[model samples]
Target: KPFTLPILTLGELTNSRFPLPIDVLYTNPNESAIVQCQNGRCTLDGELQGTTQLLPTGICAFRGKVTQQVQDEHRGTHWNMTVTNLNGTPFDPTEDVPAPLGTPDFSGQIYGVISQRNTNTVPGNLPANRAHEAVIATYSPKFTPKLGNIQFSTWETQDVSSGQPTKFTPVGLASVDANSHFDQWTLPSYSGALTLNMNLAPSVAPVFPGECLLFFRSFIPLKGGYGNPAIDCLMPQEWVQHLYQESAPSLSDVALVRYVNPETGRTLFEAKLHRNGFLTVARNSAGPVVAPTNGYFRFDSWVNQFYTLAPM
Candidate 1:
């Protein structure tokens, strides 16, 4: 289930602004993409720009043979990867797997290419997940003792509604040597950077929507290496927003990031976010109240806010 906070009502918003210093939860909901990478950078394929998409629910991975030139396959023998989208029922290359967002990127990663059709960017290539679906859309390789091959890769999310803390199990793949075996996503023996860059288009003009600000606070706890000793345990962390892809337009518009010391409550880097337009007004909506509710107030924890900085 998705993690959530207590919904609040209009009657409780002090300063008619962001309800900070309140508790929030980390959840893996529907929508929102998590861009990640290893030994490099995470990039959303440029092709997905402007195209909103979703992931089908399920577990996906790969396995394949080390083939020779299409012309030299008679002497050596080894045929692998008889699958594509390993949803509960495997797809026959042409079956079209359904999902929420799509699949993970395999730029420098290894896997089988027995043969294919459209580009992997054909949307729905991987199951979309703001949530779940058990469709395994690949070869579903079982982990065996072998040389290292197949490292993690890039992710491009079509669009999202909000951000929730998630203990997500990423997809799996097969190929060369470097990444060894991971029966499945294991809280990632690592962590990645999260970024969301987007523009705001108002139903009316932004000034009348009144305020535009960026406001958010997320908490992260130390993870175990399956290790021992507190020193071996990871330290608790919080969301750290740094870069501002595009600055805010007006002086009143605010955009800033904060990193505080949970121990001392000292401001590591703090200010200006999660306030007005950073919030919203909604209808017979279906998102949040986070409190003693009334109508709906759809809140997107990222990119939807504006920063009216001193225009250059």
Candidate 2:
């Protein structure tokens, strides 16, 4: 075991950081394996087992598989993942959307999307015990803006009409989120880090790529209300994740959609909105991407902070 024992420097230390075991493609239940980089939320990735799982009594199912990126967690960052040859088989994206009940009335008026089997009907089982203290008025306006109304301690009276009646009944479990059975609300993996621009623009909503779609709402105290909120789970594709791209990671040609605030390492800006400015991201001061000042960030309509389609 000398200091110069040939054989190509002993094959460069015989596996210095998994010199190989790379493959590409996206949208998983697993289409490929052998990724390298371990440690985080219960380690084990000898072959891309970058795991996570949850069921929670109904709806809001979960699973993530990306490998690394919290800005590389400790240093140097430059990663690339691919997904072509298309449709790597994935479906069951959960969307009858109306998992409502973020409770916002007394004339603040509530209910937004799909949830109606007939007034306050979210019961997969109640008494969720994340117990009390829900006072949300969340607002995030970068490029700059406001006017939000989706907070717990709160809504029913927002129906999306037009012969819209599909109540399946018998789905109880309250506390409204009884903690988070409101819809399996989440925000832990990575906690911060995004820069994306990928989509095929197909909907019936089946979230993937470090998974997403957390529209918020949960609670249970029915004698008359507190329905849906399982905000379509499954979006944690591994590591400190989320940075997908069917095409849009071009850092020298212009297609900005950046966010870096692992608690203020600074650089909290970008995306005048046009690519992947934001659909969902977090930093905490409450919820919808915050800072208030020190670097700059805010969301939820400046025309949606920038970019329009009407509905602000």
Candidate 3:
């Protein structure tokens, strides 16, 4: 979020009695957050001129003649404006000029939009924070891996035999690979950036000896020569009890899963499902390891055959 300071209020000025050209000096401590005059009656020094436009975020509008410009320095950037002929009209803060006002020299760097009606500008750094999201969205789409000719149609599966096994055992039904065999599978074509969505199961019971059983498979390559598989139902009730109680639980309760290489035991990637139906995944590496590509990722759920509640 951007840090916004109160709008500095400047009173009205009449044309006949006021100075022909009022010289207002503003100093900004931070050069990055330079200020610009939106609407006023004044002229700026140098060749630069002011424009009449609505301020961002409904702060103010531009009117009259005003000079708005930026001053750069080694310490930081500063925004200075000189307003002239301040006609004492009912100035609208929503239509006033915007300026960075003073430099962001405070201990906590504050940067935000300035209102023309208020001489004082709000301080904040929200601009910088929002810019990060833009960068990620732009660059993330370029990273995609190429999986060899492994046809999805050839995939096979097998049903659970008579009863559930007490201990972990890999039932060689179809293409189901044991945790030990994950290292042998090659990386898929899609990697780098990915999205995840999770759906909650209905009907939660209290006090169960056994935990819920769930499995996850991803197209992204795993680290440590094995896919990092986990059992969320095994967690304590205190951890997920609140989620079960919610009438309409948000997807925020969905946890992230990390896959690590078996040999190195280092996380290669992680997947998190956002409530907005967006799945985010980050790969750990220095240089680009995947090219740009697109494909659909799938998720499967195995419901309980018995009436018992799964773990946590």
Candidate 4:
């Protein structure tokens, strides 16, 4: 008996915060149920189940269906979610486990991770340990800048015979003066906010709204070696709430893309990008519009921190 079953719909994420969007992921096999918010209204996709199976128990569960943004115990912030009752009928308390005892618990969690791929790739088993600080969602403005390879003499220049501090010994590059190159590495002020601008020209890389891309820090040497330190995975409206926190978020570089009208400088469409390159349309004031690809897009090159054709 073959019957066509309509896609399961997870009720709206009515409690979600605007702009800074969150996504729900299912595991065991690893799947994603994206939440798209437009204007002030938000809804979850109907393709997959809203709540995931309980860990270890391997039973269907339903704690509740709501989303909450919480501060990470270790440092930054991530999303906390429960199950949504799609139909009018309530879930069976005995049949469906409201709260199961497992490794991830019955409650849901949404966090980000750092991978070595140029594009986003979701690990079925992610945020393996929350306390370990797997989610990196914060940014910092204090970092050592590049000054080229010019080595200065250190202890070799001192005379230890009778031992007196040398008047001029290169402890570190401390030239904030005009002749020195310390100020060049000063980081730009990050306000923990994301802004969307219209496509000024057609020559930019076309990163449509709701799209996610991994960006490497320009200060990282291309000739040397690239690592997670130079990566920060960014999402739409996702910003560092605690800019002055003790520990900075330690994840890879990620950014979101949205459409803006060139006529009046108004945003046409807005979306959130996932670490796995998933695009969840957040706002669509412009209706249905085609997002250009590989054409022209605006992004911070990270090199000199300006807009240019960022090599995806």
TM-score of candidate 4 against the unseen true structure: 0.17
Model 1, 1-312: lDDT tens per residue?
A: 211112332332211001112222111122132222111110111111110111222112332222221122223222222222333233332222111112322121222222222213335555323432111112123111011111211121221212221112332222223333222112121112231211211111123232221212221111212211110000001111101122223223322333233345443322233322222121122322133224212212223244432210
lDDT of 4 at 76: 40
CA-lDDT, candidates in order: 0.21, 0.20, 0.20, 0.20
**lDDT of candidate 3 over 10-107, digit per residue (tens):** 11111110111111211111223212211111111111112211111111111121122223332222222222112323333233222211100011
User: Lowest-scoring 10 consecutive residues by lDDT in candidate 1?
Assistant: 229-238
Please name the candidate that would achieve the greatest TM-score relative to the true structure: 1
Best of the two (2, 3) by TM-score: 2
Q: Root-mean-square deviation of each candidate, in angstroms?
A: 18.2, 24.5, 31.1, 24.3
Give lDDT: candidate 3, residue 270: 38
User: lDDT tens string, model 2, 6-124?
Assistant: 11111121111111111210122221322111111111111111211111111111111111211223222211111111122222223221111111111111121222232233576
Candidates sorted by TM-score, descending order? 1, 2, 4, 3
Write one digit per residue (lDDT tens) for candidate 4, span 1-312: 111112111111111111111222111111132222111110111111111221212111112221333333343433332322322133332332211211011111112221111122247633221111122111211100011001111112221111111111101121223322222112111111232212111111124432232221111111112221111112121111111121233133222343344445554443333222232332213222233222212221112112232221
Lowest-scoring 10 consecutive residues by lDDT in candidate 2? 140-149
